[PDB]
Amino acid sequence: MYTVGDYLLDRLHELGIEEIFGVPGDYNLQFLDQIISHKDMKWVGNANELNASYMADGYARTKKAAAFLTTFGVGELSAVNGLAGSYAENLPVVEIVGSPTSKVQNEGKFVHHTLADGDFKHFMKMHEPVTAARTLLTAENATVEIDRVLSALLKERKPVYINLPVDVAAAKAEKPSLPLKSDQEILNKIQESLKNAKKPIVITGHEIISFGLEKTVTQFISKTKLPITTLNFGKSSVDEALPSFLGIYNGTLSEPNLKEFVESADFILMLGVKLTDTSTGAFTHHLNENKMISLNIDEGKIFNERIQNFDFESLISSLLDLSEIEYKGKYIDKKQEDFVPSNALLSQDRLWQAVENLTQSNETIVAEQGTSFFGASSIFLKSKSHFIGQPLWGSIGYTFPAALGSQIADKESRHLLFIGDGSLQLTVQELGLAIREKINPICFIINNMWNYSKLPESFGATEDRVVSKIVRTENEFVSVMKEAQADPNRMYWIELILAK
Amino acid sequence: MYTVGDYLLDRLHELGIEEIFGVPGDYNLQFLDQIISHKDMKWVGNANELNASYMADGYARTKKAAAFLTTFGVGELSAVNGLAGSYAENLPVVEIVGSPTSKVQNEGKFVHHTLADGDFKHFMKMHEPVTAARTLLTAENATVEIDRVLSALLKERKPVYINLPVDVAAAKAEKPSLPLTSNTSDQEILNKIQESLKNAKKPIVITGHEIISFGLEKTVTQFISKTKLPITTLNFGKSSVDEALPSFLGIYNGTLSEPNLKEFVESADFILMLGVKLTDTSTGAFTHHLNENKMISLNIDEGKIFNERIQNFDFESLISSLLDLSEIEYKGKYIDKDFVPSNALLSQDRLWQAVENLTQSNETIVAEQGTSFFGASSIFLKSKSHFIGQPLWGSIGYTFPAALGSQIADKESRHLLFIGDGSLQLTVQELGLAIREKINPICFIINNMWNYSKLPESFGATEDRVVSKIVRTENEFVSVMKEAQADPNRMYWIELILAK
């Protein structure tokens, strides 16, 4: 039989979701079965819900849609932080919440995972400010409601919430039938501005990643040869290997040449950007609104004139159909110091120098808030690479599960995680999943309270699965980097000890 | 100078809170210092916020008030699930949330830990359905607001929320001078209770969780002692009376109750229910038979005298008044109510038989949902003992941090934790705190896939701090139980392997 559960899963498939994360609970058991049954969908169960939500986030970053399952009350409220972070940084994550039978909910009984007030609507209400759409399904409204909220996900690429009562998931429903899903004036104004500019700057941001427009932007920048920079909030919204990519613009913390280039530009095109404290060097950015066109998901501005009505995705896509754009100016001077290692102990500055030099193409780099994010975000990535950081929401522990989710999202991109020992502790339990799912990320755990080196062994990993290293010197670092990248079939668990 | 922070902490001292849990964050650092400075208050920092909230809950259960500190956004939303569970089971927990300077909040800036919408009020709104009172402090309203919400905590003994902006915590304030009877229908009620009790040929007192909430356990025990009244508790409120009393019957849990108790309770001619809430898991899936027509029930918010609702009364002093009843003495019969180990492997039923026989006085027993809770809740505790279970909210992982919090709350009560391997994983990181704070609980981890045995060693414990055991047989169990109870200066990490 085809059921509501089936409908939801097929819909999720259409969004490109191939794995669902989460945690079994009594009110979501039956639907969990349905996920198993669907051959086009794989269940990847976490240790805890919060980890699940983080892992779905990372998955969304790469796969461009994600979903995870929790249980009413205890599950959903565990995940809320981190669904919040998916709202803040605009990732398309579906949260499915298995709830008691509608019979139980209507009778308002004091059942487990409630406040024994017979109210089944509190937790959805609590999810209001961190979801673009929500629904409590019924047998009648199910197909309509699923479609409504998944549509909102497509529109906004912000997380959405579906409360799925046991019996509603098992109820019959009819398959698919139909799939789910001022621009001209704007384009001309952009094109006119670009033809006129003697020194333009494109600045792209997180919302580009949200809609998986990275390749569009890259292709746009390539043909035009337009100067481009990103914020750290949206690092990799363009291929950093392009010759017209300047580096990261981050207020007065920007490298001086980039800073001067950006802030002396005669035209600014900002795409999918939000200026936050940590992404603008504590608001020390100088982006004159009078010579700037900015486009975002929800709104945009043409030279201080707000625009309301447009389609963000296709408006960006249209940048490719512009014409007679070619930048003939200079850029900024880069640097070509090779990392030559010694037996010197590894320092922070040397680490990132080495990472930049040794990183390869087709890699995703994930960096946790703290020394790791600060160092890693300034790196120029290799061609066809990606970056995951969470500098707006800034939830510690995030990058570990996120890294794993992302790695699962794209097996073809080798993930390199940079996380501090302090932070890793908060989400370390997902090491279990890493071992089970036989995924192969390169994990660097920077030191500075437990002995993490021998953690894989504790979780039941052998040397055929995880390789554990300790690095103290430059030579050791180089060696282990190359060794790790040379072996795509094992996960690497590398403890860095940094000097001074 | 004396500050708002100081005010809050002095107020917290008056509630009897001697330790504050939580996690440092940039928006709560300065206030954290204030906790350190206060000699009558000790900071006990957790690994994660969720753990903190669970640990505060456990602390409240024993100390009868608790507090923990988180950081705006990421911190508070991490803890929300534990706070929800504190609301559900009615524990007096203060959540303090350090937030950005009021200057920043008013200017509505896109700072870290926000949704970059310049709204600072979302997260408090999300806490609405799980707090009895909430406040965003200002320099002006601080003393009033602190007192308002801490008063509500006193009234309802449900959790409360204080958002504390950096600058507001540092703002000048005066030491509190004043410290923190509703109706005379209390007198009528007492007489009706007394009249009913004198007349009853077979009365039953049933006490519940709300008794623990107000620390009325000793009152109830003294009441039952003088009168010799038959008493039973639900598992939702186990230990709301001293189970060692001769008139304590056991646990009433619907048709899952021991037959004699079941028949006693359900054939009673008068029922006095104090602080009771009937949930699915605490009745036998609602197989309780408590005739409302021969029953007086008192709760925090409301009560019923033979199907006549009362609204306005003081729960605490109304219970306290039960002691001033007179010419109450039960003259009736009660119900009818020893472990020899072998080399036989340890089974579930044998475990709890052994625990019941070997448990000592002045102990707290903490049991996680699943097998542990089912077995442990049926035990008769020794004199002056306590029980922690969370059968309403039923959040897995809870009992580990909760156990630790409770243990910190009362150093004089030896905690015995019974948790499943599955659940321990969710909150295991707090093992760090256990080692640091040099507390000495007896932890039984039922094994039912990582190597937990070597966990203390990982977290830096030596044999002088934690003793690690593996138990398979009955003899081994008895031996390790006695050995653990015989050594009050070390924590015990005991892995139970159960049979079929």
Author numbering:
A (entry chain D): 1 to 181, 190 to 456, 477 to 528
B (entry chain C): 1 to 180, 186 to 342, 346 to 456, 477 to 528
Quoted from the paper:
Kivd, a thiamine diphosphate (ThDP)-dependent 2-keto acid decarboxylase, belongs to the pyruvate decarboxylase family and exhibits broad substrate specificity. Kivd, the key enzyme in this pathway, catalyzes the conversion of 2-ketoisovalerate into isobutyraldehyde, which has been identified as a bottleneck in IB production. The enzyme demonstrates the highest affinity for 2-ketoisovalerate, an intermediate in the biosynthesis of the branched-chain amino acid valine. KivdS286T is a key enzyme in the 2-keto acid pathway, catalyzing the conversion of 2-ketoisovalerate (KIV) and 2-ketoisocaproate (KIC) to isobutyaldehyde and isovaleraldehyde, respectively, in Synechocystis sp. PCC 6803 (Synechocystis).
The 2.8 Å X-ray crystal structure of KivdS286T reveals a tetrameric assembly composed of four polypeptide chains. The tetrameric structure is consistent with the results obtained from gel filtration chromatography, confirming that the crystal structure of KivdS286T represents the biologically active form of the protein. Due to low electron density in the X-ray crystallographic data, several disordered regions were not modeled. These regions include residues 181–187 in chains A and B, and residues 180–195 in chains C and D. In addition, residues from 456 to 477 and from 529 to 548 in the C-terminal region of chains C and D were not included in the model. Each KivdS286T monomer consists of three distinct domains. The N-terminal PYR domain binds the pyrimidine ring of ThDP, the central R domain lacks bound cofactors, and the C-terminal PP domain interacts with the diphosphate group of ThDP. The enzyme’s active site is located at the interface between the PP and PYR domains of adjacent monomers. The ThDP cofactor, crucial for the decarboxylation reaction, is anchored within the active site through interactions with the conserved GDGX25-30NN motif, which coordinates with the diphosphate tail and an Mg2+ ion. Based on the tetrameric crystal structure of KivdS286T, one dimer contains the essential cofactors ThDP and Mg2+, which are required for the catalytic function of KivdS286T. Interestingly, the adjacent dimer lacks these cofactors.
